[PDB]
């Protein structure tokens, strides 16, 4: 019983050390946890699933958590998913690198 | 000054960025092309100059007219594009060819030109095969067209063939132009 | 339809999957209304040149009558399934067996 | 919103056009000139190869306007410069009514010496009218149509006709087919035109008075060709019609145009008319009745002047929603509009659910208040031709809520020039301009603070201002009020809703001195809405009574007490009779004088004001009821004090 | 086969109707452009839902 | 299709290498014609391709945005609205006639 | 066995000026609808004029929702069945609204 | 207006005073393009202002564009 996949995942007011993510509500009682990954490794270009690792930033009970750190000119590619008590986790969604 | 002839008006541009500043501007909104059209009545039978030279955009200072008028040649052909409207230097079309197809397809074959001039458009022969042409799809064949034979114009030739047919224009004969322009004003002062 | 202004959520839960099953068995009985079941047996034809082996497999049957008709041609006999023989089942996890991979554990909701 | 996918945008000029601030152009060119391409080899200089960059940037910022403006006036919603606007509104089937002429219907009492039946009164019949501002000078009038009269009993005629403002002019022309026939003069209401081609008729196309189902060819066309001078032309037809199109002339014809000179909107005054008639034995007996129809009359209507840019647009795009037909509430609003417009300020048509068919249309003329008749019947017919066949349009007119000001502008004597009067009138139109702009239309409220800021804008010397306020709403039939009707929509501020005047009759005889006797027509009455109570309650009373005439029975026993229910000032002997409800929280008024059971003949003329004052400062509106102040027609409530200051 | 809809107007053809359109071009050619719509059906629904 | 860039056309209308002997005159005069002509957003293109952008289904077209239905549809998918409102402003005569 | 006969055709490309007068005849034309009492008489007589003649349609207040139309055959007197039925169709594709024909 | 466009632009070249190479050629050569440009665009725009308006706007393909939109597709 896949929990409804999140929709309309956008970034807003990103800075060098701060970036914010936003997405539609998708439901009242669900939860959302996010993943963050570097892509370019030391000015290189690398292949997916051979890279990125992932970094769990935690989960949130409301949409649009605000993120810190993320050293300048690096990181990128946020990804989110939804989950709940009785539902299987949904599928990841990527934002526009 | 056979353009202009009126006033700057003022161009408000208020529909965008309200309280935009008014900028005096040469007045290009009169529907001039009509004045020319109605005024021309009675001066017709302007002959066909055939051009004959990749005259740059202004031959006005050579042939009829010559106060470097750079138009009455335009209004002749109802030219929508003052750049590619007139014919161009033979190489220009070639130069124009590349930028047209540079993005996709590279150089190509636009149509195969039967004698008597029946164009075909995405019809393709098979050498070392039957001599009959086929469309660029339905590769199973089974649906031949034009059992005959013809010769493709590729791309460069077409652009040449297309712009070179653009040399004929009206004139007003270098005789009327003074008497003509003497009318063309009168209609203008008429409506105000 | 897609992406409608209104968006609704419907579980269908579990029980409907089971309760629907119950209605199936709840009439297997004896009479005009109770639609008894019959299993049936097979074909005598060698079915191919490569027949007995591990690789290869029978051709995938077809629901069309062209496939419905060949059975009654190629079929021999039908055993009957009584109401008593059909049964409802569960994967049977058990604690303590070494043969099956995980001896105890049995996370959250599981049957032992 | 909630889901981010609903953001979209309104009409948006994309970043592609927009256009330069200058120096940003200098920035983008330098990056395109110096970078990505050259890495300068330029032979000018260190400074020159720099300096010469903006020398061609002024060439850009120029060509980024002169040639970039075209796409602004190419479209409609983003265009400026009328000419493009208008010229692009005809392919939407509109035209913007370059001007308009006044119209009335007068009934001539005249008669002929020959006594012949069926006297005619041909087209022009020149009249002249002062259209009063004081007296001096007339304008002109022409009937322009036909009619007929009938002799009955005594020998007299009632050839009642309708008339337009200007005179006429007719210019016949030979059609060269190369010659875009036009007019050139600043005039000529496109609403009323004839344009015969050498035979007759030629009912054209863009505007029908009939629609003449079928009828094929003989149409012509009227558009703009900018310049203010109207274009006429004809279709592609052949008539050797061929298939479909305009009949076209044949290569040579006498094309007779006749229009109306339409002096202008200055003629709204109307009032007294004179015959100025020379035809035949018709005597022109006068006794000319300008308004023989119905209630209060402003004089003529219309007069036009060309429509503003902000008007056309809104009506220009909406007529794509329609195609020359009205099936929709928003369609009647576009069909009662510059087509029939300049005689109607605002509409808001609606349909009542309890009564099927019968599309109801509220309308306010620019003249104010009521449309009278035959200016109503006129709006009737022009719709029903394009209407949805079974349902009949009807003009109810809105339910007017006026407001009583009593404001004082308190200027200073030092800085004036024209002093009083001219300022007394200069404050009028500024207030009037406030209504016409903001609250003239439906669903819009007004704030007295916004009225005062136009008041304080009079010239200079006026400093400060203030007003009391009362919402005036006048009942029509009176004596009853409708069922659950007569509502302000605002909080009433109890101890308000004060009467008007009234009167009585009967009361036995009461003869007076001098002549024989009188009817005792003095001793008036008037209504008061008393207090609030446990929830709404509050009742109301009909007014002062002496004794005698009533039916007391058991159901009346006239009294509210010496409590509130304030007293009318006369002898009047109190004894106020209870009449109706008036629930305060949800604004409702109810009367039905039949409760105390008097005779309607004992009351004088109906249509009485009541006018409670509002609780809150701002006055709201709903249910198709306008708040619009029109002074010139009813001065009855406007009172202003100029009380000055000497420094 | 799909019916040529070039002039029937529109509304008379509902959603998913096989009707296709055509227009002119600025250079004088013809464009066969189709409508915009899909027959896609949900998972737990089962309905067609144009 | 790219459409002409006007760069080669007027490139011959300059008096060759005369009156300016440095190559910085030719390559610069080259790249300035770009900013007028070659591109999507530049003036000569944004102009010449006008009246080709009146037909809303065409790419880069606009003014359908201003239409009343592009404003009022609540479709949750953001792209479909720009597909259907770009449509239906191509053929408006259909709906308005049939109201 | 037609009258005087030559192999028929269509025309070539239409002229220019004849294009302009058509859009003026579009806006003024209500297409795929009848919103007026004289519009029913227009569509009924345009198609079926080879059989029907002399139609008028009149809307009657106090009976909203009908808009009776009166049609006469070019041949007989009363309208036959599978004709009256067939006239009632082809107006169902357009019609409008409530207010359906009679 | 061909000479008047370059003459006004030739005065702004002396606003910087000495431009070096801009005395003979070398600038006006590149500034003649700017003079030959701003004329056509001053026209081409006006020619391109009137299309979407039907009863105005000559030639043909501009009409059929504005024709079939809001109109019918004309017979081929």
Curated annotation (Swiss-Prot), chain B:
<comment type="subunit">
    <text>Part of the baseplate macromolecular complex which consists of gp5, gp5.4, gp27 (central spike complex); gp6, gp25, gp53 (inner baseplate); gp7, gp8 (intermediate baseplate); gp9, gp10, gp11, gp12 (peripheral); gp48 and gp54 (proximal region of the tail tube). Interacts with gp25 and with the (gp6)2-gp7 heterotrimeric molecule.</text>
</comment>
<dbReference type="Pfam" id="PF11246">
    <property type="entry name" value="Phage_gp53"/>
</dbReference>
<dbReference type="GO" id="GO:0098025">
    <property type="term" value="C:virus tail, baseplate"/>
</dbReference>
<keyword id="KW-1188">Viral release from host cell</keyword>
<keyword id="KW-0426">Late protein</keyword>
<keyword id="KW-1227">Viral tail protein</keyword>
<comment type="function">
    <text>Baseplate protein that is located next to the tail tube (inner baseplate). Involved in the tail assembly. Involved in the tail assembly.</text>
</comment>
<keyword id="KW-0946">Virion</keyword>
<protein>
    <recommendedName>
        <fullName>Baseplate wedge protein gp53</fullName>
    </recommendedName>
</protein>
<dbReference type="InterPro" id="IPR022607">
    <property type="entry name" value="Phage_T4_Gp53_baseplate_wedge"/>
</dbReference>
<keyword id="KW-1226">Viral baseplate protein</keyword>
<keyword id="KW-1245">Viral tail assembly</keyword>
From Swiss-Prot, chain C:
<comment type="subunit">
    <text>Homodimer. Interacts with gp7. Part of the baseplate macromolecular complex which consists of gp5, gp5.4, gp27 (central spike complex); gp6, gp25, gp53 (inner baseplate); gp7, gp8 (intermediate baseplate); gp9, gp10, gp11, gp12 (peripheral); gp48 and gp54 (proximal region of the tail tube).</text>
</comment>
<protein>
    <recommendedName>
        <fullName>Baseplate wedge protein gp8</fullName>
    </recommendedName>
</protein>
<comment type="function">
    <text>Intermediate baseplate protein. Involved in the tail assembly.</text>
</comment>
<comment type="similarity">
    <text>Belongs to the tevenvirinae baseplate structural protein gp8 family.</text>
</comment>
UniProtKB/Swiss-Prot annotation, chain E:
<comment type="similarity">
    <text>Belongs to the T4likevirus baseplate wedge protein gp6 family.</text>
</comment>
<comment type="subunit">
    <text>Homodimer; each gp6 molecule in the ring interacts with its two neighbors, forming an N-terminal dimer with one and a C-terminal dimer with the other. Heterotrimer with gp7; gp6 is part of a (gp6)2-gp7 heterotrimeric molecule. The (gp6)2-gp7 heterotrimeric molecule further interacts with gp25 and gp53; the gp25-(gp6)2-gp7 module is involved in sheath contraction.</text>
</comment>
<protein>
    <recommendedName>
        <fullName>Baseplate wedge protein gp6</fullName>
    </recommendedName>
</protein>
<comment type="function">
    <text>Baseplate protein that is located next to the tail tube (inner baseplate). Involved in the tail assembly. The gp25-(gp6)2-gp7 module is involved in sheath contraction.</text>
</comment>
Swiss-Prot record, chain F:
<comment type="function">
    <text>Intermediate/inner baseplate protein. The gp25-(gp6)2-gp7 module is involved in sheath contraction. Involved in the tail assembly.</text>
</comment>
<comment type="similarity">
    <text>Belongs to the T4likevirus baseplate wedge protein gp7 family.</text>
</comment>
<protein>
    <recommendedName>
        <fullName>Baseplate wedge protein gp7</fullName>
    </recommendedName>
</protein>
<comment type="subunit">
    <text>Heterotrimer with gp6; assembles as a (gp6)2-gp7 heterotrimeric molecule. The (gp6)2-gp7 heterotrimeric molecule further interacts with gp25 and gp53. The gp25-(gp6)2-gp7 module is involved in sheath contraction. Interacts with gp8. Binds to gp10 homotrimer; disulfide-linked. Heteromultimer with gp10; a gp10 molecule is disulfide-linked to gp7 and the other two remaining gp10 molecules form a disulfide bond.</text>
</comment>
């Amino acid at each position: 019983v896949k929990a409804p996949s999140v929709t309309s995942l956008r970034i807003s007011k990103l800075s060098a050390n701060q970036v914010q993510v936003r997405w539609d509500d998708v439901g009242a009682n669900f939860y959302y946890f996010v993943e963050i990954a570097e892509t370019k490794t030391n000015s290189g270009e690398n292949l997916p699933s051979n890279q990125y690792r992932w970094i769990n930033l935690g989960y949130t009970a409301n949409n649009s958590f605000f993120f810190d750190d993320a050293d300048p000119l690096t990181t990128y590619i946020i990804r989110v998913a939804t989950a709940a008590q009785d539902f299987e986790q949904s599928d990841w969604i990527y934002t526009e690198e | 000054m056979l353009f202009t002839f009126f006033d700057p008006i003022e161009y408000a541009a208020k529909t965008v960025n309200k309280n935009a500043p008014t900028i005096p501007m040469t007045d290009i909104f009169r529907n001039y092309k009509d004045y020319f059209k109605r005024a021309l009545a009675g001066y017709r039978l302007r002959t066909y100059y055939i051009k004959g030279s990749p005259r740059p955009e202004e031959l006005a200072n050579a042939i009829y007219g010559n106060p470097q008028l750079y138009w009455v040649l335009l209004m002749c052909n109802d030219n929508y594009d003052p750049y590619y409207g007139w014919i161009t230097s033979q190489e220009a079309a070639y130069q124009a060819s590349i930028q047209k197809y540079k993005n996709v397809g590279g150089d190509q074959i636009v149509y195969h030109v039967n004698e008597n001039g029946e164009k075909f458009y995405n019809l393709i022969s098979y050498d070392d095969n039957p001599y009959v042409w086929y469309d660029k799809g339905d590769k199973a064949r089974k649906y031949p067209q034009y059992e005959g034979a013809l010769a493709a114009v590729d791309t460069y030739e077409a652009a040449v063939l297309e712009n070179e047919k653009l040399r004929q224009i009206k004139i007003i004969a270098k005789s009327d132009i003074n008497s003509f322009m003497n009318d063309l004003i009168r209609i203008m002062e008429k409506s105000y | 339809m897609n992406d409608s202004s209104v968006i609704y959520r419907a579980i269908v839960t579990s029980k409907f999957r089971t309760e629907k099953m119950l209605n199936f068995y709840n009439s297997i009985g004896s009479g005009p209304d109770k639609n008894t079941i019959f299993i049936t047996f097979g074909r005598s034809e060698p079915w191919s040149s490569n027949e007995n082996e591990v690789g290869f497999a029978p051709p995938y049957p077809t629901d069309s009558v062209l496939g419905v008709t060949d059975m009654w041609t190629h079929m021999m006999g039908t055993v009957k399934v009584l109401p008593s023989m059909l049964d409802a089942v569960i994967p049977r996890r058990d604690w303590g067996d070494t043969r099956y991979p995980d001896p105890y554990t049995f996370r959250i909701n599981d049957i032992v | 919103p909630v889901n981010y996918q609903l953001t979209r945008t309104a009409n948006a000029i994309p970043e592609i056009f927009v256009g330069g601030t200058f120096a940003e152009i200098k920035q983008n060119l330098i990056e395109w000139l110096n970078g990505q391409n050259e890495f300068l080899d330029y032979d000018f200089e260190g400074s020159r190869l720099n300096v010469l960059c903006d020398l061609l940037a002024y060439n850009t910022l120029y060509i980024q306007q002169f040639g970039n403006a075209a796409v602004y006036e190419s479209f409609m919603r983003t265009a400026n410069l009328r000419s493009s606007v208008v010229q692009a509104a005809q392919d939407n089937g509109y035209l913007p009514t370059s001007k308009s002429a006044a119209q009335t219907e007068i009934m001539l009492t005249c008669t002929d010496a020959l006594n012949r039946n069926y006297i005619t009164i041909p087209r022009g019949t020149r009249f002249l009218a002062y259209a009063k501002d004081t007296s001096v000078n007339p304008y002109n009038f022409v009937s322009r149509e036909d009619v007929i009269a009938i002799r009955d009993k005594n020998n007299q005629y009632f050839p009642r006709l309708k008339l337009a403002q200007g005179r006429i002019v007719r210019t016949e022309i030979i059609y060269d087919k190369l010659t875009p026939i036009i007019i050139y003069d600043k005039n000529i209401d496109r609403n009323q035109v004839k344009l015969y081609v050498d035979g007759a008729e030629w009912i054209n196309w863009t505007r029908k008075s009939m629609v003449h189902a079928g009828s094929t060819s003989t149409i012509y066309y009227m558009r703009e060709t900018i310049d203010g001078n109207t274009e006429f032309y004809f279709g592609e037809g052949e008539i050797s019609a061929n298939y479909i199109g305009g009949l076209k002339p044949t290569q040579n014809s006498t094309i007779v145009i006749e229009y109306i000179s339409t002096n202008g909107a200055d003629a709204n005054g109307a009032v007294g008319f004179s015959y100025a008639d020379t035809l035949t034995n018709i005597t022109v007996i006068n006794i000319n009745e300008n308004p023989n129809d119905d209630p209060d009359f402003v004089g003529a209507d219309g007069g036009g002047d060309p429509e503003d840019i902000e008007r056309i647009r809104e009506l220009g795009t909406i007529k794509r929603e329609t195609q020359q037909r009205c099936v929709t509430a928003t369609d009647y609003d576009t069909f009662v509009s510059e087509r029939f417009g300049s005689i109607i300020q605002a509409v808001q048509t609606f349909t009542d659910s309890t009564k099927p068919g019968y599309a109801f249309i509220a309308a306010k003329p620019k003249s104010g208040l009521y449309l009278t008749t035959v200016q109503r019947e006129d709006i009737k017919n022009y719709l029903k031709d394009y209407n949805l066949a079974p349902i009949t349009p009807s003009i109810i007119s809105p339910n007017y809520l006026f407001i009583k000001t009593n404001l004082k502008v308190t200027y200073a004597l030092n800085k004036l020039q024209e002093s009083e009067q001219w300022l007394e009138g200069q404050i009028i139109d500024k207030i009037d301009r406030y209504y016409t702009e903001d609250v003239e239309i439906f669903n819009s409220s007004f704030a007295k603070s916004k009225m005062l800021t136009y008041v304080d804008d009079a010239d200079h010397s006026v400093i400060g201002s203030s007003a009391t306020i009362q919402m005036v709403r006048e009942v029509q039939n009176f004596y009853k009020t409708p069922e659950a009707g007569i509502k302000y929509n605002n909080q009433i501020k109890d101890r308000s809703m004060e009467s008007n005047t009234f009167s009585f009759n009967s009361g036995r005889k009461v003869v007076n001195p001098d002549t024989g006797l009188e009817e005792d027509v003095l001793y008036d009455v008037r209504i008061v809405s008393t207090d609030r109570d446990s929830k709404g309650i509050g009742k109301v009373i009909i007014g002062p009574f002496a004794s005698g005439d009533v039916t007391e029975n058991e159901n009346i026993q006239p009294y509210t007490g010496n409590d509130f229910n304030k007293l009318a000032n006369s002898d009047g002997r109190d004894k106020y009779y209870v009449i109706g409800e008036i629930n305060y929280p949800a604004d409702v008024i109810y009367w039905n004088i039949a409760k105390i059971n008097l005779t309607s003949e004992k009351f004088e003329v109906q249509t009485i004001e009541l006018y409670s004052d509002p609780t809150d400062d701002v006055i709201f509106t709903r249910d198709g009821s306008l708040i619009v102040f029109e002074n010139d027609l009813r001065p009855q409530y406007l009172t202003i004090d100029l009380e000055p200051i000497s420094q | 086969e799909w019916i040529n809809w070039t002039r029937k107007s529109m509304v008379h053809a509902g959603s998913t109707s096989t009707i296709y359109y055509m227009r002119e071009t600025i250079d004088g050619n013809t464009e066969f452009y189709f409508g915009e719509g899909e027959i896609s059906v949900n998972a737990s629904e089962g309905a067609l839902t144009a | 299709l790219a459409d002409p860039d006007l760069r080669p056309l007027i490139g011959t209308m300059m008096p060759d290498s005369y009156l300016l002997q440095d190559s910085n005159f030719e390559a610069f005069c080259e790249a300035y014609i770009q900013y007028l002509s070659d591109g999507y957003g530049t003036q000569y293109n944004n102009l010449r391709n006008l009246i080709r952008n009146q037909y809303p289904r065409e790419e880069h077209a606009w003014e359908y945005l201003w239409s009343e239905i592009y404003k009022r549809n609540i479709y949750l998918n953001a792209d479909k609205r720009d597909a259907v409102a770009r449509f239906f402003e191509s053929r408006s005569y259909d709906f308005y006639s049939t109201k």
